[PDB]
């Protein structure tokens, strides 16, 4: 079963283009779970997709649960339960698995057509949003999408709400919502066109 496990990890890592250290952390977590029952009968497909999620979190390599859910052929149901299970079942703490919205800026910026200037302004907006307590409860993707959108404008490398919404995997309405709040509450002076 451990043979089929590592084989699915290759599908996951190939589809997600996961780097060696993340893939290796996923496998190591899995064997760490093997020694710990792996539950009476928690699916061999569920635990590994869980592991890759926790691996990406532990290593700060952003990977929205959506992205891992489809390529693994399944849903947030058993995925979430096995994740949540293997998480505290192991040495995993909310602090170690904690991923900031800024942790997604690089991946999404790479897909949008980079520029360290833009990535920097987005991280500043995101850091500033936290300090001004405007982030609690909001999803990371929605906040990073708006920040990235606002930064592209500020730095003169405009990207449309539609382009940003598609890489972040949120709707344009969500980007519009987060972006309008960030602009007003942080008093950002966004230029025209």
């Amino acid at each position: 079963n451990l043979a089929f496990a590592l084989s699915e990890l290759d599908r996951i890592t190939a589809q997600l283009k996961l780097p060696r250290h993340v893939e290796e952390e996923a496998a190591r977590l899995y064997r760490e779970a093997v020694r710990k029952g792996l539950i009476r009968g928690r699916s061999i497909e569920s635990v590994m997709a869980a592991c890759v999620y926790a691996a990406c979190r532990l290593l700060k390599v952003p990977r929205t649960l959506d992205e891992i859910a489809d390529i693994a052929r399944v849903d947030k149901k058993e995925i979430g339960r096995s994740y949540r299970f293997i998480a505290r079942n192991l040495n995993l703490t909310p602090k170690k698995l904690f991923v900031k919205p800024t942790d997604y800026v690089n991946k999404f910026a790479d897909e949008l057509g980079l520029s360290e200037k833009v990535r920097r302004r987005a991280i500043e907006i995101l850091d500033e949003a936290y300090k001004r307590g405007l982030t609690s409860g909001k999803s990371p993707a929605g906040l990073v999408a708006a920040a990235l959108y606002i930064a592209s404008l500020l730095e003169g490398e405009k990207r449309t709400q539609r382009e940003v919404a598609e890489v972040a995997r949120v709707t344009e309405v969500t980007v519009r919502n987060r972006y309008k709040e960030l602009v007003e509450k942080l008093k950002i002076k966004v230029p025209i066109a």
Binding site: T64, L65, K76, G80, R84, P94, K95, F98, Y130, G133, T135, S136, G137, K138, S139, P140, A141
Partner: protein
């Protein structure tokens, strides 16, 4: 002691199991409930929706029922009495009065202030927070066994308690943890 002077709870739903003490012929009970759904293949009971006490009733051949949607115990008492009379109208006889047991109560409320759930998730022990999936902190209260959903606005949802005093105790226990910071 823990300051509950700003806590406000509101009953949103009460779930009760009931025993009518009579065998029921579901095919014949269907005429009693207008609009009732019954597919014995997928679920063994009739899904009945009352208008007056606006509640849903799941009716089983064993004479047991589950009443949900109730905002009060009186809602449940009246639903049981209406069904009981309808049953009598069709020939059913009961060995004794209905046994009503509240099994679950869902409350919505306010704990007094706002929270930065990111901080809560890192300071409140034994809680869950996954803003990528849901905007609230899931907190499991051991005794009395229940769950409280805490949101940034300070609003909450308490589920699982079987009485009002229990839900108040569950909130008191959560506030004991939140107030250490």
């Amino acid at each position: 002691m823990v300051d509950m002077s700003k806590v406000k709870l509101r009953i949103e739903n009460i779930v009760a199991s009931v025993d009518l003490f009579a065998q029921l012929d579901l095919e014949k009970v269907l005429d009693l409930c207008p609009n009732s759904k019954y597919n014995p293949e997928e679920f063994p009971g009739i899904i009945c929706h009352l208008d007056d006490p606006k509640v849903a009733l799941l009716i089983f051949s064993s004479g047991k029922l589950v009443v949900t949607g109730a905002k009060s115990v009186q809602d449940i008492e009246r639903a049981v009495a209406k069904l009981a009379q309808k049953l009598k109208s069709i020939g059913v006889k009961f060995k004794r009065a209905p046994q009503i047991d509240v099994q679950n109560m869902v409350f919505s409320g306010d704990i007094g202030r706002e929270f930065n759930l990111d901080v809560v998730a890192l300071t409140l022990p034994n809680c869950e927070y996954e803003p990528e999936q849901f905007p609230g902190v899931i907190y499991r209260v051991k005794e009395p066994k229940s769950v409280i959903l805490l949101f940034s606005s300070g609003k909450i949802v308490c589920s699982g308690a079987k009485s009002e005093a229990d839900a108040w105790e569950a909130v008191r226990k959560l506030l004991r943890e939140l107030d250490k910071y």
